[PDB]
Design a protein around this ligand. Structure first.
Ligand SMILES: Nc1ncnc2c1ncn2[C@@H]1O[C@H](COP(=O)(O)OP(=O)(O)O)[C@@H](O)[C@H]1O
Ligand SMILES: Nc1ncnc2c1ncn2[C@@H]1O[C@H](COP(=O)(O)OP(=O)(O)O)[C@@H](O)[C@H]1O
Ligand SMILES: Nc1ncnc2c1ncn2[C@@H]1O[C@H](COP(=O)(O)OP(=O)(O)O)[C@@H](O)[C@H]1O
Ligand SMILES: Nc1ncnc2c1ncn2[C@@H]1O[C@H](COP(=O)(O)OP(=O)(O)O)[C@@H](O)[C@H]1O
Ligand SMILES: [Ca+2]
Ligand SMILES: [Ca+2]
Ligand SMILES: [Ca+2]
Ligand SMILES: [Ca+2]
Ligand SMILES: [Cl-]
Ligand SMILES: [Cl-]
Ligand SMILES: [Cl-]
Lengths: 444, 446
């Protein structure tokens, strides 16, 4: 087992990783910005290294500071969490070349599957259905862009190849808006991701977002761990996730899961990852592979019993897969509500001091957050401050449980989306299940 | 069926019951003392009724006030939780006589099995091995009392028939301490339980405390839900509980579980309950049946997936058991640490205002408590303020989770036993498993 690791992240995921480390007796190094000294996991970590001032560009994206932190503490591995450098092939490469284990896929796999244009190309090559699109980067020729749009059929969406969290995405309904949309998306993607490559994809009218969790050891064994439905979204970012996906039958589950496990073996995938699909009229269409842990991984944990972070760590230690496919069993249902520090109605950021906090508790309730009363939410990072996950023997119980937990959850001093999450749980169509990716913004 | 119930209790268990009701759409009436207006479950309840001033004898033991609360709100059932009036046959009778459902066994069953002298007699009648003892109440004849102690062999223990929480129990090493030990336990039992009846039991030197969770519908169906080891103890009261019990083999689990389920059917048991045993040399010896929910019920919930409170309510509504025996599956391991507002060294109660509170979290971490920052723990009640329960795929993972969760738990402003629980989890002998009921006080030097 890994002796010591740097947790190259912050907030809830850094604490999630710290806990898994502690259970496995792995020493922890928390690297943090000067704004994050009072993070719960920083205070719990065995060692801490300040890697720069508050802006992410100067700290959490500071590759040489993070790699140096591993050297100064004698760590043997680095866990990137999600976001930040986790899908950055350059970082993965540099980690390995400095003598450290990168807790994730090989750098070449991150280039293959992390970049969204080449992932689509790879999946098409593999015989995995994708969404019709430009099948390559858009150039500057507007006649050519219009011609691609016409071939696939309006509406379309301009998507950043390096995009994440729904940033760098713009829907286009017709020719008149195409140029300014491609131009704006490029500018957003260049700013957020230092990568102005965009592609075009057909905008699907009625799909659900359904994704399959995979685990592969890099030795040729791969498994799938059921699926998740993450169709409740705002600004193309997930708000609620659940597992398993409602209406997905065992026959269909195994069909898509086997395809994902096979895809892992073929490309030589290593570690945890997720294949994300649009599910429409009984068919799955590949949109993205996250070559990293998923934010919403706890719902899969609840319904399978598998600890996905521990599996990541075991795999990084060069352990083969312990779990066989036949040993994976879906039991019950879990729902996750993201908790974000933003106005529940205007959706504008609400950083600042949390004056009162109370987490919910009870049978089947899991709270995933670094926040505490007295803690200051900084302005510099993403608004997601916590995750509430409720498990039940069935979906009705899980939702009932969530409804009650959200009523017990207190976060005062800043604005949150807790009241929005309450509204979603009370929604007749969410209760029905199988609402499409456009539903939440329709409702709102 | 149950559209409104009175929660006849307080603190963590009241909140536990409330949560089950909220999930089932059951309206709640929180009865409380004047010192308990700001209890979390009171604030969350649909309706609240003040049943008396601060002392328990004037509030949570106030039978007329609790029944009046049920009457005035139009409640159909009353959950007594644990402690207080949960094992009070007179209360159960009166609740039933007044036209309400008592969420628990029939009153006759409470007097048969709640009373500890009759429970032993009943179990002996049914051919279940008990610990050798007086087999009846102790009188005032000391020549007879000494004769009993001779038959069973010192050390012996004087136990209150109405006793609970380790109160009203004294170990006797020889004839020289016998008479005053009897007199003092009588006195202690009289003041604490309004019952001076005491009996004598052989004091077992190397047993473990292993208990079997049961559920029965009162319609003839009865099941056991594996077992719990509760051997970490101070002053004869549980400090740490875990499930399943280490080193209990499948043949032993079914042997004892089947006996307990049969006993339920035979006495017409209804609801949740626990048969408590001393386990030594591969043999079980019955000591107590709790005719009510256990404090440590969550460890069994985590390894079986069964919601025990919801089952109590279902049974109380007249529904048959939701599960057959062949459907009970044990998966993983769970450990519970009780959290008490007390000096971690001397164990003197530590009431007062909680100035800072932070609860642990994560995969497999379950925190069961009403406490919050700004909350004042009153001097009037039992010191237990919360329970931390950690589940894992195996015992090692559960313990490792508990270590981590204990490091996260912040309760400032009052003394707690958090530091004790940390020491227990770090104990190598505990980590191996199977330590006996005397181990913790041995470790501490008590
Ligand atoms: N390629 C990327 N580059 C930078 N940040 C990213 C990237 N992908 C995701 N993120 C960020 O990571 C966090 C989690 O991503 P999100 O899409 O919300 O969850 P997930 O993809 O795990 O369901 C968000 O703050 C998001 O903006
Ligand atoms: N071609 C499409 N048609 C309709 N909706 C889409 C399409 N592509 C993406 N979306 C919606 O936007 C969300 C974010 O897109 P995704 O490609 O996963 O970007 P990110 O890398 O930012 O997560 C998806 O979950 C889906 O609901
Ligand atoms: N027969 C009884 N009468 C009054 N109080 C009781 C009785 N039995 C238990 N209690 C109280 O109930 C609480 C829980 O009991 P305890 O013995 O700690 O848990 P359990 O028996 O559920 O493992 C304690 O405060 C204890 O003093
Ligand atoms: N005969 C005995 N010999 C040794 N230890 C005992 C005996 N009876 C009880 N104990 C210890 O004292 C604890 C409390 O006894 P119990 O009869 O369960 O009383 P209570 O009603 O207070 O829970 C038990 O859990 C056990 O560890
Ligand atoms: Ca995505
Ligand atoms: Ca991605
Ligand atoms: Ca007992
Ligand atoms: Ca009892
Ligand atoms: Cl934050
Ligand atoms: Cl409460
Ligand atoms: Cl209290």
């Amino acid at each position: 087992m890994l002796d010591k690791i740097v947790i190259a992240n912050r907030g809830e995921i850094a604490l999630r990783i710290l806990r898994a480390c502690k259970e496995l007796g792995i020493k922890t190094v928390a690297v943090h910005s000067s704004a994050d000294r009072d993070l719960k996991h920083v205070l719990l970590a065995d060692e801490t290294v300040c890697i720069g001032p508050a802006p992410s560009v100067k700290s959490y994206l500071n590759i040489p500071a993070i790699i140096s932190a591993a050297e100064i503490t004698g760590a043997v591995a680095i866990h990137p969490g999600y976001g930040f450098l986790s899908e950055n092939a350059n970082f993965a490469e540099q980690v390995e070349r400095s003598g450290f284990i990168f807790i994730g896929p090989k750098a070449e796999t991150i280039r293959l599957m992390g970049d969204k244009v080449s992932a689509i190309a790879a999946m098409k090559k593999a015989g995995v259905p994708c969404v019709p699109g430009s099948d390559g980067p858009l150039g500057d020729d507007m006649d050519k862009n219009r011609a691609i749009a016409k071939r696939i059929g309006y509406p379309v969406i301009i998507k950043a190849s390096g995009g994440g969290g729904g940033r760098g995405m713009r829907v286009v309904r017709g020719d008149a808006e195409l140029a300014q949309s491609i131009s704006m998306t490029r500018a957003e993607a260049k700013a957020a991701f230092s990568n102005d490559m965009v592609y075009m994809e057909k905008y699907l009218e009625n799909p659900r977002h359904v994704e399959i969790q995979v685990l592969a050891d890099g030795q040729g064994n791969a498994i799938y761990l059921a699926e998740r439905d993450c169709s409740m979204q705002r600004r193309h970012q997930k708000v609620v996730e659940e597992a398993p996906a409602p209406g997905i039958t065992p026959e269909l589950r195994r069909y898509i899961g086997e395809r994902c496990a096979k895809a892992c073996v073929d490309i030589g995938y290593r570690g945890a990852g997720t294949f994300e699909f649009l599910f429409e009229n009984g068919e799955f269409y590949f949109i993205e592979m996250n070559t990293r842990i998923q934010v919403e991984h706890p719902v899969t944990e609840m319904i399978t019993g598998v600890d996905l972070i521990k599996e990541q760590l075991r795999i990084a230690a060069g352990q083969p897969l312990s779990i066989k496919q036949e040993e994976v069993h879906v039991r019950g249902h879990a729902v996750e509500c993201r908790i974000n520090a933003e106005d529940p109605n205007t959706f504008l950021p609400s950083p600042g001091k949390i004056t009162r906090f109370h987490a919910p508790g009870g049978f089947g309730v899991r709270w995933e957050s670094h926040i505490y009363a007295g803690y200051t939410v900084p302005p510099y990072y993403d608004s997601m401050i916590g995750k509430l996950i409720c498990y039940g023997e069935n979906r009705d119980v899980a939702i009932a449980r969530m409804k009650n937990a959200l009523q017990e959850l207190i976060i005062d001093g800043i604005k949150t989306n807790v009241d929005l999450q309450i509204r979603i749980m009370n929604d007749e169509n969410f209760q029905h299940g199988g609402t499409n990716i456009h539903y939440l913004e329709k409702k709102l």
